[PDB]
Each structure stands twice: as C-alpha cells, then as structure tokens.
Amino acid sequence: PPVVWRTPLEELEVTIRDTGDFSTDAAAADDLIRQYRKQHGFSRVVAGRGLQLGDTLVIDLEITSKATGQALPGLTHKRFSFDTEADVLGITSGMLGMKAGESRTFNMSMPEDYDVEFWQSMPVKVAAKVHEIFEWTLPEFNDEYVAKQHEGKWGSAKEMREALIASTAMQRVTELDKALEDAVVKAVADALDMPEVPPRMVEQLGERQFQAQLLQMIEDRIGSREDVEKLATEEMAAEFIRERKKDLEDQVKFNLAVDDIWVRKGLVLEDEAVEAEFSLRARQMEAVGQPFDREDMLDDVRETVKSVTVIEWLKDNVKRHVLPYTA
C-alpha cells in the first residue's frame, strides 16, 4: 500500500513535441480545399490503368481480426463508395494497381487514431473486390468558385484558406493538450520504484477498458448491438488485454500514485463531481440495458474523478518543456 517515489514529485517534468507549424497547416488546408472542390468535380470511369491516389471507387470490403477472424462491424459492405484522398481506414496503399473485377486479401494495422477506440492499432486482414474506379478534374480555386459554391460562409479564396488553416491549427492545440495528459501520466508511471505492478490490478483494468470500449461502440451506433456483443468473447478480451500490457501497467502505477498524491496534497473529492460521473455511467448502462453492482461502479467512478483532479493539478504544477516541430 505505500508508494515509493524513486524520482520526487517536486522534480518532475514532461516534454512534448509540437506536431506541426504554419507550412504543415497550410498544406492540410490546401488538402481540405481539394476535398471541397472534389464535391463539385467532374468524374470519368478509369480505363487502361489501375487504382492511383486521387481516384474514388466502389468496392466489396470485408475487414476481419487477424487473431480471431471476427468481422469488424461497420466495415463489411457490398457497394461501399470510397475516396482514396479521404481514407479513414488506410486501405489505399494495399489497393494501388487494382482494376475493375480484381480481388485482394492483404494484412494491415488499423490506424492508431481510429474513431472506434476498440480497433486502434489492431492487426487486421482486408478482403476487397473493386466494382468500379473513377478519376476527377477539379474546378480552379479562385474567388468566383468560392462565391458560386460556398457563398455565405466565406467572401474570398483567401478567407476560406485562412479559415481552414485556423481550424487545423486549433486542432493541433487540443491534440497537444491531450499529449500533455498522456506525458504527465507516463511521467508519474516512470518516476516510481515498483519492479512488478500488482497483476490482478492490470487484468481488472484491462477488463473495465474492454467493456467501456464495447459500450462506446453500441452507443455510437458503429455496428449492430448483436454484432458488437458477438465480439464480447473471452478470446477477444484476452487479445485486447495482452496487446496493451505495458500501457495498462503504466495506468495502474498512475492510479496507485494518484492514491498517494490525494493524501500528500490533501485533495478533497466533491460529492457533486462523483454523482455527475455516476449518473453519466448509469445512463450508458441503461441505454444498453445491462445490470451493474452499485458499490463497484462507485469505486470505479471515484477512481476516475480523482484521476481527473490529479491530472489537472499536475498540468498546472509540473515542469513543462515543449520541443518544436522539425521536418
């Protein structure tokens, strides 16, 4: 129960990289402008050539777990429309050169930033059949295009570019705030003498995270409730916990460390904050029609609210070093 601070909490520092600069935002705005224009683009069936970056297409898609052969819900479709240049999946690289009629099975890691948290970095097999391929010429980007096609939003080509640059730069700011939370959490985890993290505590947290992400899937309607509950297998749950063992141990060290700091810095739980987090958790559990132990939820709601309060504290009294972006 007593925590051993190898490196003191007073001499504790995080370091994070800025994740872009002006020329990165401008590039990204230019790519958003291209996607707006492609909604007003001219299309033609491609012939005597295979799929290239820039094309759009219609495909049969089937994406399955490598470990379990389970189909990822949301990602089986007979006539999926798809732009190579707005590719949330990363399936483009593995499809270049395909032609109408051709099929392909190929291995891939799901993206690390995928919206559906369950599937981040998961090794996956993609089966794809291409029904048809389309290429595009875009209208020129000038004030006339802006006035004809996005009127009332922007009064100029310049206005639109500036708007989209600001929005991309505002997104780096909130991504960076998140990397700070993660760095501050990895800081405390790393600044502890604990050669072995209590191992039921890693499994228990693995299991809670597993459930929280299955629930996020049902409430965000990213696949049928019956399909999502078909991935709630022991095999899937094993695979999830193992492929995050390091992340889960760091997270337990932090939770134990959070229990130390709470006494040391004399922090006080506000009952209104615990009841706000509990009711939020209880709504979720109702909408998905599932029972829970009130007391066990309460230990978990209390763990989460403390964690939120110690992260806020660390954020405003830990030594920040922000490194800058480089090519």
Numbering used by the authors: 140 to 466
Show me the paper's own sentences about this structure.
Here, the crystal structure of the plastidic trigger factor from the green alga Chlamydomonas reinhardtii is presented at 2.6 Å resolution. Due to the high intramolecular flexibility of the protein, diffraction to this resolution was only achieved using a protein that lacked the N-terminal ribosome-binding domain. The resulting atomic structure of CrTIG1 lacks the first 137 amino acids of the mature protein (without the chloroplast signal peptide) and will be referred to here as CrTIG1ΔRBD. Visible electron density starts with amino acid Val138 at the beginning of the linker region between the N-terminal RBD and the middle PPIase domain, with β5 being the first secondary-structure element. The protein resembles the dragon-like structure described for bacterial trigger factors, but without the tail (the RBD). The PPIase domain, which forms the head of the dragon-like structure, is prominently tilted downwards in CrTIG1ΔRBD towards the arms. The C-terminal domain of CrTIG1 stands out by its unique features and differently arranged arms, which are not found in bacterial trigger factors. The arms are oriented towards each other and do not show the prominent ‘open arms’ conformation of the bacterial trigger factors, which build a cavity for substrate protein binding. Comparison of both chains in the asymmetric unit of the crystal structure shows differences in the position of arm 1 but smaller differences in arm 2. Indeed, we measured a PPIase activity of CrTIG1 of 0.0057 µM −1 s−1, which is 100-fold lower than that of EcTF with the substrate, but still measurable and within the range of other plant FKBP proteins.
Prokaryotic cells and the chloroplasts of plant cells possess the ribosome-associated chaperone trigger factor, which binds nascent polypeptides at their exit stage from the ribosomal tunnel. The structure of bacterial trigger factor has been well characterized and it has a dragon-shaped conformation, with flexible domains responsible for ribosome binding, peptidyl-prolyl cis–trans isomerization (PPIase) activity and substrate protein binding. In eukaryotic cells, trigger factors are only found in the chloroplasts of plants. Chloroplast trigger factors (hereafter referred to as TIG1s) display a remarkable sequence variance compared with prokaryotic TFs, while the typical organization of the three domains remains conserved.
